[PDB]
Amino acid sequence: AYLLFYTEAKVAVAVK
Amino acid sequence: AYLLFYTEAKVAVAVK
Amino acid sequence: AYLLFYTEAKVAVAVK
Amino acid sequence: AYLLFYTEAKVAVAVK
Amino acid sequence: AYLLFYTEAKVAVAVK
Amino acid sequence: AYLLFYTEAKVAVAVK
Amino acid sequence: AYLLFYTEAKVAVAVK
Amino acid sequence: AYLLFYTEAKVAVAVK
Amino acid sequence: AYLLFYTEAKVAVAVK
Amino acid sequence: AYLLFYTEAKVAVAVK
Amino acid sequence: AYLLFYTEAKVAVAVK
Amino acid sequence: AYLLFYTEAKVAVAVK
Numbered sequence: 001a002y003l004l005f006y007t008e009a010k011v012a013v014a015v016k
Numbered sequence: 017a018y019l020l021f022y023t024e025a026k027v028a029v030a031v032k
Numbered sequence: 033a034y035l036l037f038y039t040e041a042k043v044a045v046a047v048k
Numbered sequence: 049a050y051l052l053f054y055t056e057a058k059v060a061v062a063v064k
Numbered sequence: 065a066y067l068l069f070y071t072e073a074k075v076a077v078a079v080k
Numbered sequence: 081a082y083l084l085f086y087t088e089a090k091v092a093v094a095v096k
Numbered sequence: 097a098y099l100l101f102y103t104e105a106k107v108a109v110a111v112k
Numbered sequence: 113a114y115l116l117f118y119t120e121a122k123v124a125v126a127v128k
Numbered sequence: 129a130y131l132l133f134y135t136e137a138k139v140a141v142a143v144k
Numbered sequence: 145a146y147l148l149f150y151t152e153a154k155v156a157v158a159v160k
Numbered sequence: 161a162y163l164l165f166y167t168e169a170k171v172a173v174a175v176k
Numbered sequence: 177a178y179l180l181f182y183t184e185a186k187v188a189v190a191v192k
């Protein structure tokens with residue numbers, strides 16, 4: 001898996 | 017803010 | 033676990 | 049020049 | 065935003 | 081500018 | 097040797 | 113302080 | 129492929 | 145191979 | 161081993 | 177400052 005960044009704006013991180 | 021890694025095992029990432 | 037940059041395009045962080 | 053990781057998502061390397 | 069490694073020790077990733 | 085990666089196979093680097 | 101970021105949390109740089 | 117990669121070539125770490 | 133910081137001296141980014 | 149940087153004028157990156 | 165950033169003030173680096 | 181790597185054998189790190 002890798003770290004997925006996404007914008008909420010502010011940066012947030014998910015794991016895929 | 018900074019990236020906080022934490023284990024649930026698997027690593028998860030929060031933004032503090 | 034290791035935090036390893038990679039690219040197959042942009043870069044991502046793998047969790048190993 | 050600095051090599052600065054950033055994200056707007058994947059990561060990219062800015063050159064400053 | 066930039067992803068900047070930093071230390072005050074341990075190392076952390078700042079989001080700026 | 082930032083470093084752009086592309087497939088040429090081997091990874092190759094350009095600048096945008 | 098590689099310089100590999102890792103986390104067990106903050107991060108650290110492994111020498112492999 | 114930030115740990116910033118840079119290049120003048122190989123790379124290097126600046127402590128700012 | 130992975131982008132791995134590497135040194136034997138200065139640091140380089142290995143493509144693996 | 146390694147990422148080879150050169151500062152020519154914008155930075156340029158070769159794969160050696 | 162791992163790189164240890166510590167205080168001596170100035171930061172210092174030990175290969176632990 | 178910047179991190180200087182030199183071999184004394186084992187590699188030593190100095191902050192210059």
Ligand SMILES: [Cl-]
Binds near residue numbers: 021023104
């Ligand atoms: Cl934890």
Ligand SMILES: [Cl-]
């Ligand atoms: Cl805190």
Ligand SMILES: [Cl-]
Binds near residue numbers: 033034104
């Ligand atoms: Cl680990």
Ligand SMILES: [Cl-]
Binds near residue numbers: 080
């Ligand atoms: Cl900054």
Ligand SMILES: [Cl-]
Binds near residue numbers: 081
């Ligand atoms: Cl520009």
Ligand SMILES: [Cl-]
Binds near residue numbers: 127177178
């Ligand atoms: Cl410097």
Ligand code: NA
Binds near residue numbers: 008012
């Ligand atoms: Na969310």
